[PDB]
Ligand binder design. Structure first.
Ligand SMILES: [Zn+2]
Lengths: 60, 99, 182, 59, 107, 99, 240, 175
RNA sequence: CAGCCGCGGUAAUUCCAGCUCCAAUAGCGUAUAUUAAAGUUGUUGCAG
């Protein structure tokens, strides 16, 4: 009478492979991650430009 | 819809009057005059309508899903705050019982 | 007067041309802007009444709790202040210092009960209508806004007949009878 | 209510019993109707629908 | 002027409702009311690099709306998504109610 | 689930309308009934509010908008279905230009 | 590539956003009809007939200042009437964009030390007349103290470890009080033995030691790894 | 042909801007979480560490007979640079002539020193501001309030005199 | 509050697809006892 368990829990290595992929997909949400620079032609910002938001750390 | 009776709604205050406008039965001149464009313009109209309803239904789906998110975050947040307040009201009684 | 400099804010601080100590926060000005009192000195001829009833309620509290002169006069005062509608109930004599207000004795005025029972829609237009002479309490016309009412006469605040705004609301609801001349 | 009983004697035997629809609307049977035999008059919490089934849980 | 706003009034709606043009694009949440001063302009891709960003002479158009209407994959997606939104929105309203009543009535 | 089995918190499936009683479609169950009942109750609540306002109209009620706004023969409210920034009847020279 | 965008003014004066399905940071073109480093352009027909004026796409992967703008800086001091002293005008890449943001009524002094970039700077400053190219080392501002007077903002895109001394010398000579100091700090080019936050903290401390009050810093992370823009103002009396 | 409802014009305390309480006639700012951080790791700090000291940490160091730089070195097993801000130094000088030993142990050439640029000598405000600006700092402190502030802001390791040597908590590579 | 219990049904059923998520992982819980941390007092706590 066991609960249904996880194929990813059946290997200790694959679980940390797939909770690190989840973590570094969440890291793109909190920060802005340097992906590697300009790939091809500069197409544009592809997601929008906000002219009201300033995401910069003010001093004191 | 809410069908308020005529005997009630004729005896309503001036602020609470119900603005219910009757349908038009006469083929009026401005409606029989006014021109609509065809072909590329009617498919532009169809396209703009499809785009606007897809945008509105996507926004309604997003805000309903956010409502379902934040009611369960409210539930777990209230449980964590109740546990915290229980811990505070026993630690205060500990402090005063020692002092 | 010049939004003074800093060595200026410090050198003289109690200077204030606008609001003095004896203005009491301009409560007379504030409550007559609220309830739209035409002339001056109405506030203070109500405040004298408030001071007189709290003074004689004080000396009715002074007299011993057994004599019928004291108890008859405090129930008589409480019933008269209910009968002019200054109060809303016949409760404790502690309400004769907590609940009597120059505000409430302005609440019993004729334009503000008019705005209260929605005869006008603002107190300014109420004073417009009763300076133009449209309303009446029972038979007689009312010209001045200083006529406050009693608890019986919030039922016969009505316009006069041939008042043409009464005629416009009747022809709005198209119940406009004209055998009754309005 | 139409057919849970075959006779007004049966409904008379079962008067006052609490029934309910499948919607959980509680109810009570009140009196057997005269001419259609197993048909009776019940009163409910509010207006039940034509797509419901009433239930008398017995043992 | 309003005379020119009544010519570019449709692609401003497209830019306002960007977020539901492609099902894979997913912009960041701004509102974007119509700005008070704007200007409609055309991209000059120069004569240096070819074939990559190059939209040819035979397919250059005059609005954003004609490009979106010429896209045939977007037409597939808009027609399909609109039909499923339609049949969700008419799910139980009045044709359902009167066919339920006719179901009651037929027997 | 602290001491509960997953074979214990199973899924009980719900039953359909009887096929003999099938012309009255969809045997409705308790979620359907509460969707019915709270709709009825909110509409009765707003009807009761409007009935109370009709009882407390106070017929000496003058507004300035009861010069422009008017009332049909049965006593209800005429709401002009065109504009309220336009005019329904247009002048003779306007008709000359449009024609 | 032949599509149509709508131009819209940014929060920052003198720079614009072209909204399409991907929106572009965009500046007006001071020399219409040619591109400087191969960026794309937008030609609007603004209303004698209407005139075709045009606009240039500012590429954030080829401009630290554009990476700062579209990461979100609360205040640039590069403004449409100003004077900017560009230090490390390594080619005409960002100096052209700073030049036409600053406009025809303002001046950009483009200081560069190498000579083939200086040749390209002079040939670009022909068609952009509001650029004064100065081929000189910024580590000795006295060698060109005669050519420049009283700038309003300094921008520093130098990539040398004596950056803060260069910025301080040029500010004390040519910047005015409460003027702008925009710095692009590259951690790896200052020093690579410490981490990026240590070198940014040290550079900000060096700026306030040379009495430039920092207002704001931004990491500008999706376009450059381990970079920063520090925006400060030249306080000259009382950082407190 | 006069007007109706005529009043005497008085001043409006709700409206008149000539008086003082009526002298009160958008761009957001969401500061991004630092690129030095993983989720709560602070992956970027590396030895040689640099540690901001405050006054009760110095007092507890002398009360427990720990050297500053040697206690830091055998706590972290790394080379430390300790930093006394001018406000921490101002606080030690304001502590009076009872704390002369602590002041002239903070006067040490091995302890480097920063230059804070603000008014007042509130070291807790200065340490909190300059650590949440930059995330390249260890905070050595023993104030309960400052310890709670620092361990609520993420990615900042906290050092404290405990027992007879220094302890470190939010630094995940100590051994 | 809870719910392996429902009308039928056990060769019957195919069902929230075996409900979802989390952490450790050849290891992982529980009970009891514990150690360390400083708020270390400046008095008076009973019926002497
Ligand atoms: Zn300080």
């Amino acid at each position: 009478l066991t609960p249904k368990r996880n194929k990813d829990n059946r290997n200790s290595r694959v679980k940390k492979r797939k909770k690190y992929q989840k973590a570094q997909k969440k890291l793109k949400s909190v920060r802005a991650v340097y992906s590697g620079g300009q790939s091809g032609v500069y197409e544009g910002e592809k997601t929008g430009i906000k002219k009201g938001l300033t995401r910069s750390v003010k001093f004191k | 819809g809410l069908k308020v009776p005529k005997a009630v709604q004729k005896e309503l205050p001036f602020k609470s009057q119900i603005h219910q406008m009757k349908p038009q039965k006469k083929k009026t001149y401005m409606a029989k005059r006014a021109v609509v464009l065809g072909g590329d313009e009617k498919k532009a109209r169809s396209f703009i309508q499809k785009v606007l309803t897809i945008s509105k239904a996507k926004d309604s789906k997003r805000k309903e899903q956010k409502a379902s998110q934040r009611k369960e975050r409210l539930k777990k947040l209230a449980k964590m705050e109740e546990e915290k307040s229980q811990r505070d009201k026993e630690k205060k009684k500990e402090y005063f019982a020692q002092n | 007067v010049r939004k003074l400099k800093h060595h200026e804010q410090k050198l003289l601080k109690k200077v204030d041309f606008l609001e003095w100590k004896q203005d009491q926060g301009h409560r007379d000005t504030q409550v007559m802007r609220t309830y739209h009192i035409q002339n001056r000195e109405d506030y203070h001829k109500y405040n004298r009444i408030c001071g007189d009833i709290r003074r004689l309620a004080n000396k009715l509290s002074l007299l011993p709790p057994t004599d019928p002169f004291r108890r008859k006069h405090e129930q008589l005062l409480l019933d008269k202040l209910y009968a002019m509608g200054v109060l809303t109930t016949k409760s404790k004599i502690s309400d004769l210092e907590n609940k009597v207000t120059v505000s409430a004795i302005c609440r019993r005025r004729l334009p503000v009960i008019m705005h209260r029972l929605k005869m006008a829609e603002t107190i300014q237009d109420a004073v417009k209508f009763i300076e133009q002479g449209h309303v009446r309490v029972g038979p007689n016309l009312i010209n001045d806004p200083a006529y406050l009412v009693t608890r019986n006469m919030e039922d016969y605040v009505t316009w006069v007949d041939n008042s043409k705004i009464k005629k416009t609301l009747l022809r709005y609801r198209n119940q406009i009878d004209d055998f009754d001349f309005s | 209510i139409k057919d849970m009983f075959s006779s007004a004697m049966e409904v008379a035997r079962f008067e006052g019993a609490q029934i309910k629809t499948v919607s959980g609307i509680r109810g009570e049977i009140k009196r057997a109707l005269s001419k259609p035999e197993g048909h009776y008059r019940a009163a409910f919490e509010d207006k039940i629908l034509m797509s419901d089934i009433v239930i008398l849980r017995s043992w | 002027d309003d005379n020119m706003r009544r010519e570019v009034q449709r692609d401003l709606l497209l830019i306002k409702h960007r977020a539901a043009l492609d099902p894979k694009r997913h912009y960041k949440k701004q509102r974007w009311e119509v700005p008070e001063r704007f200007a409609i302009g055309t991209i000059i891709e120069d004569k240096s690099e070819f074939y990559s960003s190059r939209m040819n002479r035979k397919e250059r158009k005059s609005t954003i709306l004609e490009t979106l209407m010429g896209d045939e994959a977007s037409n597939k997606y808009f027609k399909r998504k609109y039909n499923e939104i339609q049949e969700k929105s008419t799910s139980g309203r009045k044709a359902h109610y009167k066919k339920m009543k006719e179901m009651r009535k037929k027997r | 689930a602290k001491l509960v089995h997953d074979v214990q918190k199973k899924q009980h499936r719900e039953r359909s309308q009887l096929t003999s009683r099938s012309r009255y479609g969809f045997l409705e169950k308790h979620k359907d009934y509460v969707k019915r009942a709270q709709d009825f109750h909110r509409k009765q609540s707003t009807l009761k509010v409007l009935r109370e306002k009709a009882k407390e109209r106070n017929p000496d009620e003058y507004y300035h908008a009861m010069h422009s706004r008017k009332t049909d023969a049965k006593g209800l409210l005429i709401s002009s279905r065109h504009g309220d920034e336009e005019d329904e009847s247009l002048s003779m020279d306007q008709v000359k230009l449009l024609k | 590539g032949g599509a149509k965008v709508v131009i819209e003014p940014h929060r920052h004066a003198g720079v614009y956003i072209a909204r399409g399905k991907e929106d572009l940071l965009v500046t007006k073109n001071m020399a219409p009809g040619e591109s400087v480093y191969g960026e794309k352009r937008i030609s609007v027909e603004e209303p004698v007939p209407p005139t075709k004026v045009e606009y240039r796409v500012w590429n954030p992967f080829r401009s630290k200042l554009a990476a700062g703008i579209m990461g979100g800086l609360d205040e640039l001091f590069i403004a449409p009437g100003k004077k900017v002293l560009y230090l490390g005008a390594a080619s005409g890449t960002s100096v052209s964009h700073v030049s036409d943001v600053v406009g025809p009524e303002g001046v950009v002094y483009a200081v560069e030390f190498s000579h083939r970039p200086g040749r390209e700077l002079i040939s670009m400053a022909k068609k952009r007349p509001n650029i004064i190219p100065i081929i000189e080392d910024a580590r000795h501002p006295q060698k060109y103290r005669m050519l420049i007077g009283m700038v309003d903002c300094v921008f520093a895109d130098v990539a040398q470890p004596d950056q803060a001394r260069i910025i301080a010398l040029n500010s004390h000579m040519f910047l005015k009080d409460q003027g702008g100091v925009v710095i692009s700090i590259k951690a790896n080019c200052i020093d690579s033995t410490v981490d990026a936050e240590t070198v940014f903290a040290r550079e900000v401390q060096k700026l306030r030691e040379e009495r430039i009050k920092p207002l704001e810093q931004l990491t500008l992370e999706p376009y450059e790894r381990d970079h920063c823009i520090v925006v400060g103002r030249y306080m000259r009396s009382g950082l407190k | 042909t006069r007007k109706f409802g005529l009043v005497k014009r008085t001043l409006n305390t709700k409206k008149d801007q000539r008086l003082k309480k009526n002298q009160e006639n958008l761009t957001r700012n969401i500061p991004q979480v630092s690129s030095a951080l993983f989720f709560q790791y602070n992956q970027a700090i590396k030895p040689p560490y640099q540690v901001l000291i405050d006054t009760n940490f110095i007092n507890f160091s002398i009360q427990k007979k720990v050297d500053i730089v040697r206690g830091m070195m055998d706590c972290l097993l790394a080379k430390c640079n300790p930093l006394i801000t001018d406000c921490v130094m101002a606080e030690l000088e304001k502590l009076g002539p009872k704390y002369r030993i602590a002041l002239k142990l903070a006067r040490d050439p091995r302890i480097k020193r920063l230059s804070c640029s603000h008014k007042g000598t509130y070291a807790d405000d200065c340490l909190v501001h300059r650590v949440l600006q930059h995330k390249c700092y260890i905070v050595a402190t023993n104030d309960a309030g400052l310890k709670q502030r620092i361990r609520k802001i993420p990615g900042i390791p906290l050092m404290s005199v405990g027992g007879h040597a220094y302890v470190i908590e939010k630094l995940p590579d100590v051994f």
